Amino acid sequence: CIKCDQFVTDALKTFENTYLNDHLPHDIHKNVMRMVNHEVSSFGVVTSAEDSYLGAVDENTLEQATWSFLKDLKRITDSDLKGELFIKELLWMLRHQKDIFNNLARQFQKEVLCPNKCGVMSQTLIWCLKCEKQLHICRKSLDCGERHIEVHRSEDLVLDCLLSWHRASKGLTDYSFYRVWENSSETLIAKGKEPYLTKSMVGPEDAGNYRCVLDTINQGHATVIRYDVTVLPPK
Ligand SMILES: *[C@@H]1O[C@H](CO)[C@@H](O)[C@H](O)[C@H]1NC(C)=O
């Protein structure tokens, strides 16, 4: 994906136009660049089987790849290497940066990608072949689970709808908190960007089932959490 970052392409433009003259004879420049560009364009391109894990990467990981690649390309720019050794080390550095990228993508999937164990997440991915930003939808069963909440009388009742991955998810609209009646109907008791609901000075009338549903601009509901609230005596 590094080809998708303006800093990499500008870096290669300066490398070809300015820095190559220092290291190598002019007449071998173009061919060298061809190879360089070829290798830089092969970054992240998928061979099927497992390789699909390199076809797309989040903006942050693309940033890491960009900056390590630029670090090495600058190292070689500043090296005393020339001729055959400069070419050998250049191609080796491209192969090594390709390894670094592969590691960053593999890692990105293991941890960063589809971290949600429930609900629907939306992550901005860069597809490396065409350099296209798309919204990747990690879709799992919308209902995340049921919380058993117990609160003494005249205390604060807090319903926490926040999930780990929520902060990272894209396109989140407001959380909506509903009260689910024994009659099998519900009324919205709150809506807004706050991940939680607070009800003050609860009483037995507040005992019951509650529900939290997070909404998105496009994809749908991101998360649902149900709450079973039992009001205890004051002491
Ligand atoms: C049940 O439903 C009715 C209308 O369907 C609603 O007005 C009422 O407040 C609800 N209350 C209980 C205790 O079920």
Residue corresponding to tokens 């055959």 = 84
Residue 136 lies in a domain: no
- Contact 1/65 with Cβ under 8 angstroms? yes
- Contact 179/187 with Cβ under 8 angstroms? yes
- Can you give 31-94 as a three-state secondary structure string? HHHHHHHHHHHCCCCCCCHHHHHHCEEEHHHHHHHHHHHHHHHHHHHHCCCCHHHHHHHHHHHH
> Do residues 160 and 214 share a domain?
yes
* Ligand 1 near 47 CB (within 6 A): no
Residue corresponding to tokens 């019951």 = 208
| Domain of 147, in residue numbers | 143-232
- Contact 131/44 with Cβ under 8 angstroms? no
Q: Ligand 1 mean position to 184 CA, how many Å?
A: 8
Write out the E strands in the chain.
56-58, 120-127, 132-139, 143-152, 157-160, 172-180, 186-192, 196-199, 208-216, 221-232
Of 2, 209, 24, 189, which is closest to residue 104 (Cα–Cα)?
Answer: 2
Q: Ligand 1 mean position to 152 CA, how many Å?
A: 24
Residue 119 lies in a domain: no
Structure determination technique employed: X-ray
Q: Which of 97, 113, 129 is the last residue of a domain?
A: 113
Q: Ligand 1 mean position to 185 CA, how many Å?
A: 7
Structural domains in the chain (count): 2
> Do residues 191 and 91 share a domain?
no
- Contact 55/45 with Cβ under 8 angstroms? yes
Residues found in the chain = 235
- CB atoms near residue 10 (< 10 Å): 11
Of 7, 8, 113, 25, which is closest to residue 61 (Cα–Cα)?
Answer: 113
Angle in degrees, 0-180, between the axes of helices 29-41 and 6-14, rounded to the nearest 10: 170
* Ligand 1 near 184 CB (within 6 A): no
Query: Which H helix or E strand runs over 95?
Result: helix 83-107
Residue 98 lies in a domain: yes
- Contact 82/24 with Cβ under 8 angstroms? yes
- CB atoms near residue 78 (< 10 Å): 10
> Do residues 107 and 7 share a domain?
yes
Q: Which of 95, 113, 131 is the last residue of a domain?
A: 113
Q: Alpha-carbon distance 154 to 232, whole Å?
A: 10
Residue corresponding to tokens 């000075």 = 201
Residue 60: both structure tokens together: 């942050």
Ligand 1: nearest atom to the Cα of 181: 14
> Do residues 93 and 44 share a domain?
yes
* Ligand 1 near 205 CB (within 6 A): no
Q: Which of 183, 186, 189, 205 for a ligand 1 pocket mutation test, highest count of atoms within 8 Å of Cβ?
A: 183
Q: Alpha-carbon distance 144 to 147, whole Å?
A: 10
Ligand 1: nearest atom to the Cα of 182: 14
Residue 163 lies in a domain: yes
- CB atoms near residue 11 (< 10 Å): 20
> Do residues 225 and 160 share a domain?
yes
Q: Ligand 1 mean position to 186 CA, how many Å?
A: 9
> Do residues 11 and 107 share a domain?
yes
- Contact 151/138 with Cβ under 8 angstroms? no
Question: Any idea what the CATH number is for the domain that residue 194 is in?
Answer: 2.60.40.10
Q: Alpha-carbon distance 141 to 120, whole Å?
A: 8
* List of residues 6+ apart from 2 with CB closer than 8 A: 8, 40, 43, 44, 62, 65, 66, 69, 97, 101
Q: Alpha-carbon distance 64 to 102, whole Å?
A: 12
- Contact 118/143 with Cβ under 8 angstroms? yes
> Do residues 7 and 90 share a domain?
yes
Q: Alpha-carbon distance 36 to 136, whole Å?
A: 31
